[PDB]
C-alpha cells in the first residue's frame, strides 16, 4: 500500500467527549519477536507438580494483542472526569489498527 | 470593574425590587382633618417568589494526564452531614467553597 518509505498511518492517542458518548484513543509501539523460533511445541505440568497445578496445552508461535485494560484507553484525568460525573458506563465499538509495521 | 469583593462587574445589573403594603387608614374622624392620617391598621403580607437565572458554562478543556485537585465530601464519619439540618433542623454552610479547582496553563 506504502511501499517503503511512505508512512500507512497515524498517531492517534486522545479522547473525546460528545454528550453521552466519550471515545478514546490509543496508540503504542509495540515489537514482537520470533516465538518457539517458528514452532508449536506440546507444554505440560512439570512431572512431580500437586494435582491441583496439572495441566495440558500448546504453545504457538503466535502473539496476540491485550488492550483488555481500562488504563490502555483512559488516562488518569480521563477516568477522575468519567467516574466524578457518571452513573454508569459501557462499551459500544472499537476499531482496531496495525501501521508502520518495520 | 470587576468587583473587589467578587463576582461580574455590570453597567445595567439587575434591577431592585421594591414591595411595601399599601397603608390602610384606620377609622376616620366624621369632621373633616387637614392634618395627614396617623393612624392605620396594622398589618404584614407573605407570599412566595421565584428566581430563575440561566447561565452560560465554559466547558473545560484540558489535557493533563495525571488527575486535578476536585471538591469532595469527607467519607469519615460524622455526627452530622455537611450543608444539611442538624437535630433542631438548623441549616448550615461548614465552609467557604470557591470555584478554582481544575487547572488550566498560563
Redesign the interface.
Given at each position: 500500500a506504502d511501499g517503503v518509505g511512505n508512512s500507512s498511518g497515524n498517531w492517534h492517542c486522545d479522547s473525546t467527549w460528545m454528550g453521552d458518548r466519550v471515545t478514546t484513543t490509543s496508540t503504542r509501539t509495540w515489537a514482537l519477536p520470533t516465538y518457539n523460533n517458528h514452532l508449536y511445541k506440546q507444554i505440560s505440568s512439570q512431572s512431580g507438580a500437586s494435582n491441583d497445578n496439572h495441566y495440558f496445552g500448546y504453545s504457538t508461535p503466535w502473539g496476540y494483542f491485550d488492550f483488555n485494560r481500562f488504563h490502555c484507553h483512559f488516562?488518569?484525568?480521563d477516568?477522575?472526569r468519567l467516574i466524578?460525573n457518571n452513573w454508569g458506563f459501557r462499551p459500544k465499538r472499537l476499531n482496531f489498527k496495525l501501521f508502520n509495521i518495520q | 470593574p470587576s468587583p473587589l469583593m467578587g463576582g461580574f462587574g455590570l453597567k445595567h445589573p439587575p434591577p431592585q425590587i421594591l414591595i411595601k403594603n399599601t397603608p390602610v387608614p384606620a377609622n376616620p374622624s366624621t369632621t373633616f382633618s387637614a392634618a395627614k392620617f396617623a393612624s392605620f391598621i396594622t398589618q404584614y403580607s407573605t407570599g412566595q417568589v421565584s428566581v430563575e437565572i440561566e447561565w452560560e458554562l465554559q466547558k473545560e478543556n484540558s489535557k493533563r494526564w495525571n488527575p486535578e485537585i476536585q471538591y469532595t465530601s469527607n467519607y469519615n464519619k460524622s455526627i452530622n452531614v455537611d450543608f444539611t439540618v442538624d437535630t433542631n433542623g438548623v441549616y448550615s454552610e461548614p465552609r467557604p467553597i470557591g470555584t478554582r479547582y481544575l487547572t488550566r496553563n498560563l
Amino acid at each position: 500500500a506504502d511501499g517503503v518509505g511512505n508512512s500507512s498511518g497515524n498517531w492517534h492517542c486522545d479522547s473525546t467527549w460528545m454528550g453521552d458518548r466519550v471515545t478514546t484513543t490509543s496508540t503504542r509501539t509495540w515489537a514482537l519477536p520470533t516465538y518457539n523460533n517458528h514452532l508449536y511445541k506440546q507444554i505440560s505440568s512439570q512431572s512431580g507438580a500437586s494435582n491441583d497445578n496439572h495441566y495440558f496445552g500448546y504453545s504457538t508461535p503466535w502473539g496476540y494483542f491485550d488492550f483488555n485494560r481500562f488504563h490502555c484507553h483512559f488516562s488518569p484525568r480521563d477516568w477522575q472526569r468519567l467516574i466524578n460525573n457518571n452513573w454508569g458506563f459501557r462499551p459500544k465499538r472499537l476499531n482496531f489498527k496495525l501501521f508502520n509495521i518495520q | 470593574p470587576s468587583p473587589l469583593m467578587g463576582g461580574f462587574g455590570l453597567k445595567h445589573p439587575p434591577p431592585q425590587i421594591l414591595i411595601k403594603n399599601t397603608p390602610v387608614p384606620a377609622n376616620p374622624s366624621t369632621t373633616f382633618s387637614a392634618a395627614k392620617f396617623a393612624s392605620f391598621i396594622t398589618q404584614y403580607s407573605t407570599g412566595q417568589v421565584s428566581v430563575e437565572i440561566e447561565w452560560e458554562l465554559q466547558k473545560e478543556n484540558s489535557k493533563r494526564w495525571n488527575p486535578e485537585i476536585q471538591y469532595t465530601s469527607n467519607y469519615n464519619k460524622s455526627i452530622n452531614v455537611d450543608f444539611t439540618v442538624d437535630t433542631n433542623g438548623v441549616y448550615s454552610e461548614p465552609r467557604p467553597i470557591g470555584t478554582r479547582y481544575l487547572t488550566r496553563n498560563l
